[PDB]
């Protein structure tokens, strides 16, 4: 169940680890174009807040959600900002959304007095005053509903298949971040010279097994000269003293 294009539902996700590898294995996922960052480097950025919009659009107007574009359904119901950050995920769904008897569960607006700002959830069922004189009450001459409904049939080919599209836009370092991707954990070498990056500690020196008694939240190890001489290895409670050979 997804919301309509104009009545799009926004779900906010924060304070977790965002893994895109378990999401990239989707079968009908073909539409993918990211602008802010390279898609391969999505796992090494920390995000203040993440919200997603889910809505169903026709097969012909799939790319109308792309930033900087205009159209009948992309100018009156939902649109992306020109400086759109991130990228959307779209996949064809002609086995569930499409109905044999015709799917009429969504509405699209084609009539409007003016345009709407991108990232707007404001919509109404106000009639379109097409005629010069004011139109109120019931429909008369030049008085029509600004919105029209989908007409989805399985006999339709490309250009009419419904697409389930999720839009992943987010802020970039506007606050203490909440969502970060998975971080690289490249093995561990002991009793041998190695460069290390243990949670932001940079240096050189062989890593040896040590048995000092730390405390529940004691990570670093500081010596007399105020230099690191012990580190608590991430993903483990092990403590290793850093000394040359």
């Amino acid at each position, epitope marked *: 169940r997804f919301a309509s294009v104009y009545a799009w539902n926004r779900k906010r996700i924060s304070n977790c680890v965002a893994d895109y590898s378990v999401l990239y294995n989707l079968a009908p996922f073909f539409t993918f174009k990211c602008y802010g960052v390279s898609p391969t480097k999505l796992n090494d950025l920390c995000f203040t807040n993440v919200y997603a919009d889910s809505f169903v659009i026709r097969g012909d107007e799939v790319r109308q959600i792309a930033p900087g574009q205009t159209g009948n359904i992309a100018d009156y119901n939902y649109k992306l900002p020109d400086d759109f950050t991130g990228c959307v995920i779209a996949w064809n769904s002609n086995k569930l959304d499409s109905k044999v008897s015709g799917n009429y569960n969504y509405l699209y607006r*084609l009539f409007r007095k003016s345009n709407l700002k991108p990232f707007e959830r404001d919509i109404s069922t106000e009639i379109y005053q097409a*005629g010069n*004189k004011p139109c109120n009450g019931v429909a008369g*001459f*030049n008085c*029509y509903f600004p919105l029209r409904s989908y007409s989805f049939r399985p006999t339709y080919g490309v250009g009419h298949q419904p697409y389930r599209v999720v839009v992943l836009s987010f802020e970039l370092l506007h606050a203490p971040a909440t969502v970060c991707g998975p971080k690289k954990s490249t093995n561990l070498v002991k009793n041998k010279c190695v460069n290390f990056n243990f949670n932001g500690l940079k240096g050189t020196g062989v890593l040896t097994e040590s048995n000092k008694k730390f405390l529940p939240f004691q990570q670093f190890g500081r010596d007399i000269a105020d230099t690191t001489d012990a580190v608590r290895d991430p993903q483990t409670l092990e403590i290793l003293d850093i000394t040359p050979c």
Partner: antibody
Amino acid sequence: QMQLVQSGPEVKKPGTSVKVSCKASGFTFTDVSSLQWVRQARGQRLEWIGWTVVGTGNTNYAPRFQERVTITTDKSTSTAYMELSSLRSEDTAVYYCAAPFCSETSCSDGFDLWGQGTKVTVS
Amino acid sequence: EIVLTQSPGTLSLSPGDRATLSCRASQSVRISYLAWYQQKPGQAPRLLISGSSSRATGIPDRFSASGSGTDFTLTISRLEPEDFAVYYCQQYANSPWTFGQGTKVEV
């Protein structure tokens, strides 16, 4: 120029199906403009066959015009295919398709354009 | 299902004279959805006044629409030689139009 083109007079027989097409040069059916059809006899009172909207798909017809007459709107060609069935001897008249110039900008509360129609006679 | 009454049915006036017509509808009263049309004998019809408040392109200044009640009045400044056609007044808000007999002006 703002003109409407249509086929010439036609002669037919009862018990058949008639398809009438009229195009507009310099005018388009767009999304807001809605056209209508009238039948004009030999100096007799007009009758409203029906009006349809190309975009919204609104269908309205006269009470006696809901079983033998149909209007199908084509946006790509901006035309109104008029389908008539079980035609009788009273259909010998001139059919007109009329639409106002209302294309996403402005329009009045009346019908502006008027084609020459088709002089259709059924024996 | 609309009954339209137009008066006068026939006009016998000298050419170039001012003319007045009135009409009424048996359906619900609408003040902004009345239009006046003229159809030539054997030629395509042309609109005269749309909405009873303004004219269209090419409409002469003679045609003027007025009326506060159900009756709608159309005034013509002078009996222009090529304006001698048949008049019709039509509503828009009510049921599908049942066009009246038609008021035709002639010498």
